């Protein structure tokens, strides 16, 4: 398969109008991060929610 453990997100973008998160994989260097579609991150919802909260407060501050 192709399933790995997510450590943190490092960015957000829209690709063809759809949300994607720059995904840092645990146990792999930052150079190995990949852009991933939101709908593939269902098991990462705490991390996404926490990241979206981060982005909100970093925006406001």
């Amino acid at each position: 398969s192709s399933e790995y453990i997510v450590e943190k997100f490092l960015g957000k973008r829209y690709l063809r109008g759809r949300p994607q998160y720059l995904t840092k994989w645990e146990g792999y260097p930052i150079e190995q991060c990949t852009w991933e579609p939101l709908e593939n991150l269902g098991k990462c919802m705490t991390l996404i929610a926490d990241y979206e909260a981060e982005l909100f407060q970093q925006s406001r501050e």
């Binding site: 192709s2 453990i5 997510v6 990949t34 990462c44």
Partner: peptide, 8 residues
């Protein structure tokens, strides 16, 4: 743990 499919 939190996992996801990895794009190539």
């Amino acid at each position: 743990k939190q996992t996801a499919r990895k794009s190539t």
